[PDB]
């Protein structure tokens, strides 16, 4: 197989999402750097690839894709028979059952957690501590619902790790390990169990190792 | 087959997304009301169906699902042979090509446009004109990119209507028809062409009618 091409730095949450997915699916890849600190993602040449001037972007022999969850769904389809076969289900029901919790990442967990990560770690503008308080409360109410769900099932969608869990890793990791908001996860028993299990998965450990080696 | 069951009011954008998809896919359904003006979505029996206390929810003979886009992917999957057969593509590549624009709805267009609709039409608290402007500016930037894309293809993902276009209808229609931010769409000639084209589909007209008879 020819390695697929991924654009962007591993430190980027949306890039990490794709990388963890590739590793779970045993898909070889080649990572092309895009230096966000130098604004390289806004260069006309890159905009030909990702028209919104964001990373990641994905290329293989057949298609160019953007939006990390779309990239991941394609990887899971194309390589269904490979690696972790059950990551995004094995049939129409199991896929949909996982998918609703992927959408919960995208629409519910993702916005407050992502804004927290951005405002605390990746913004050059002074932290509006009111806006922080708003999003912490937002995220706490979400995790209170996760707490009940995770008292019924080991992972969000059922008994096995799925792409719905994987998709929480990038924002979760920055909050737990690079901000003082980790207690939102670790003070909730079932959420803490879940977070501890998913963050210690070998694929995610491999992504963290990639960040370490630049 | 048996009709599927959908929960919530058609005035809800996320419910509207599901309804338009059901109609495109020629799927029979029962719509069960949930009055948001009276807190019905928070009653314990409904929380058993939708753990976030939001609408829509979906049930058929095999599964209960929430999150409108997951509900719609399931419908397109289960009823692929029915109705509009190409709505979410017909193989792995055409599906992924559409899906990236569906994610653009979910992560890029959706948040600022949805926030505008909320702050302008469905919020008790006085509008913060600075936050209004922040989101107008975000959405302008997104639609500048749409304008370029829609000068190359008739719809977002190509020359045929897809779920990616469908998913924009709920927030688009509120902005265009119930706010003074419609110029965002109508001032851009290709976006305006596209908007007119998708919002005049019978499926969308039917959803707007259901609203009236609600
Ligand atoms: S992580 C760096 C930023 N990327 C994204 O936010 C990608 C978001 C998409 N919704 C996705 O693929 O999931 C980024 O590119 N920031 C630079 C910028 O100029 O925005
Ligand atoms: S449209 C009314 C509200 N629902 C949603 O926002 C659903 C969003 C999901 N991400 C989706 O299914 O797409 C709603 O239910 N408001 C009531 C409330 O108490 O929040």
Numbering used by the authors:
A (entry chain B), B (entry chain A): 2 to 215
The authors write:
Glutathione transferases (GSTs; EC 2.5.1.18) represent a ubiquitous multigenic family of enzymes that conjugate the reduced tripeptide glutathione (GSH, γ-Glu-Cys-Gly) on a wide range of endogenous and exogenous electrophilic molecules. At the structural level, GSTFs exist as homodimers, the dimerization interface involving mainly hydrophobic surface patches. Each monomer comprises an active site region formed by a glutathione binding pocket (G-site) primarily involving residues from the conserved N-terminal thioredoxin domain and an hydrophobic pocket (H-site) primarily involving residues from the less conserved C-terminal domain. A PttGSTF1 monomer consists of an N-terminal domain (β1α1β2α2β3β4α3) and a C-terminal domain composed of α-helices (α4α5α6α6′α7α8) as classically observed in most GST classes.
